[PDB]
Amino acid sequence: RTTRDDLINGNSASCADVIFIYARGSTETGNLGTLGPSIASNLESAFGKDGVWIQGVGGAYRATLGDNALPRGTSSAAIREMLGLFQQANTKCPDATLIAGGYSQGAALAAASIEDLDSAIRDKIAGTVLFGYTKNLQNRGRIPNYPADRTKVFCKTGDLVCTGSLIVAAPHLAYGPDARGPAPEFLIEKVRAVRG
C-alpha cells in the first residue's frame, strides 16, 4: 500500500475525477511512505476507489537525507520529477481536479514544484497538505506562488523542522493521526467545493 502509480499506469480513456500527487519523506519506503497510504484510504472512502487516482513521487526523487540541506530543501531533479507528474495529470486528464501533499523533504518538494508550475496547472490544484514542512518558517507557512486558502500545514509544537532547523525530534514523527483525519478531510473539502 506504500506504492501507488495510478496516474503513470492510468490511461486517458478512463480518467479519475480527482488525482492526488504525494511526495514522501526522506528514507521512506515505496512512493507514499508512512503518511501517504492513510491519506489515500480516506480519499478513496470519500470519492470511491474509481473516483480518485493516487500517485506517489518516485523516479528521480531519491528522498535522500542530504538533499534537505540544499537551498530549496530538495534536489532540482526531484522538483523536475514532481513537475512532470502534475504536467502528466494535466495532459492525460484535463478535466480532473488535482490535489497534492508531502511530508518533510516531500513537503519542500511539493512546495517547490507547485511554485514552478504554470498557473493553468497550478490553478487546478484545489488543495495541498504539508506535514513537518521543512520550509515552514522560511516560507511563512505558505507555498510561494500558491494561495494560502488552498494550503494546510501540519506543523506540531516541538517539530523543529517547522521553526527553521533540520533537527528531527519526536513531534516530527507524530503526523499519523493528522494523515488519517484532518489532512485528507481538507483535501476532500477543497475538491468537493470545486466540483460541486
UniProtKB/Swiss-Prot annotation:
It is found in: Secreted. InterPro entries: AB_hydrolase_fold, Cutinase/axe, CUTINASE_1, CUTINASE_2, Cutinase_monf. Inhibited by n-undecyl phosphonate (C11Y4). Inhibited by paraoxon. Changing residue 166 to A: Increases activity on p-nitrophenyl butyrate, poly(ethylene terephthalate) (PET) and polyamide 6,6. Pfam families: Cutinase. May have promising applications in chemical and textile industries as it is capable of hydrolyzing a variety of substrates including soluble esters and insoluble triglycerides. Can hydrolyze and thus modulate the surface properties of synthetic fibers such as the plastic poly(ethylene terephthalate) (PET), or the textile fibers polyamide 6,6, polyester and acrylic. Changing residue 168 to A: Increases activity on p-nitrophenyl butyrate and poly(ethylene terephthalate) (PET). PROSITE patterns: CUTINASE_1, CUTINASE_2. Disulfide bonds join 15-93, 155-162. This is Cutinase 1. The lineage of its organism: Eukaryota, Fungi, Dikarya, Ascomycota, Pezizomycotina.
